[PDB]
Amino acid sequence: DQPMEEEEVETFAFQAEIAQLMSLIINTFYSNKEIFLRELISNSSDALDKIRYESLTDPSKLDSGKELHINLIPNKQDRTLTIVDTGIGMTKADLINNLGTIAKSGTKAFMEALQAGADISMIGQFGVGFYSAYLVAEKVTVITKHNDDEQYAWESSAGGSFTVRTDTGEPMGRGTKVILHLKEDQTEYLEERRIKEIVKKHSQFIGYPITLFVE
Numbered sequence: 086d087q088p089m090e091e092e093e094v095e096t097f098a099f100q101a102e103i104a105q106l107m108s109l110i111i112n113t114f115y116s117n118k119e120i121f122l123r124e125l126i127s128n129s130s131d132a133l134d135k136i137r138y139e140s141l142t143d144p145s146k147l148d149s150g151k152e153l154h155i156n157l158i159p160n161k162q163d164r165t166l167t168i169v170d171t172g173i174g175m176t177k178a179d180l181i182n183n184l185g186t187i188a189k190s191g192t193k194a195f196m197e198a199l200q201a202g203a204d205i206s207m208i209g210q211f212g213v214g215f216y217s218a219y220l221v222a223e224k225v226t227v228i229t230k231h232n233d234d235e236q237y238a239w240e241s242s243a244g245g246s247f248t249v250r251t252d253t254g255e256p257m258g259r260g261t262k263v264i265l266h267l268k269e270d271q272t273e274y275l276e277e278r279r280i281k282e283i284v285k286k287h288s289q290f291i292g293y294p295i296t297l298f299v300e
């Protein structure tokens with residue numbers, strides 16, 4: 086009736102500088118942590134620009150979702166804030182290579198900038214804004230579905246490694262879901278008023294609709 090299923094999980098080590106950056110971010114006392122949302126929203130916009138670009142030539146790539154938008158979903162019960170987009174999504178290699186193992190010139194440049202007095206809010210200018218998620222999350226789970234590929238789950242609690250596996254959770258439409266498992270002292274980002282506030286303050290001019298789902 087219920088034959089056991091089996092799944093192989095792959096664990097990778099973050100490139101040295103990325104691990105260093107995550108450590109700095111996850112432990113920082115920075116007082117303007119709210120910019121994490123702006124960074125994740127900008128990432129979704131980039132993903133949306135990319136699927137839109139592909140649709141310019143191949144309209145069928147939108148069959149998996151014609152609406153290009155961003156959804157924000159807070160969950161107080163399991164203390165998570167999820168940012169979902171119907172962007173291009175990522176392949177398994179996209180996750181393994183571009184979300185952890187391959188060095189990014191911006192990583193060291195950003196840490197050097199901070200040492201030179203830069204502000205953490207500038208992280209996006211160095212192309213490593215995703216990692217700002219750890220300003221408020223103790224763990225980040227990235228669920229992604231690229232056209233013509235399976236759904237994958239990337240996950241890391243910033244202990245120097247991250248995992249990647251074929252997702253067996255709820256199937257999602259094309260796009261990416263960044264699930265922020267918030268730190269116990271950062272639950273304010275689960276509140277409707279707070280979310281509205283930071284979206285209006287840092288992400289009012291986005292090229293795609295953004296919707297907050299409550300209840």
Ligand SMILES: CO[C@H]1/C=C\C=C(/C)C(=O)NC2=CC(=O)C(NCCN(C)C)=C(C[C@@H](C)C[C@H](OC)[C@H](O)[C@@H](C)/C=C(\C)[C@@H]1OC(N)=O)C2=O
Pocket residue numbers: 127128129130131132135170172173174175179180183184212213214215216227260261263
């Ligand atoms: C975890 O989610 C993001 C993946 C990696 C992001 C990382 C490492 C990060 O910190 N910042 C980046 C933001 C980007 O927009 C971004 N896009 C290229 C350049 N324009 C912005 C100017 C990159 C480079 C690279 C990882 C893109 C992804 O590659 C599979 C993919 O091409 C794109 C589509 C994927 C993303 C931006 C993903 O976001 C969503 N929502 O899909 C960055 O590094």
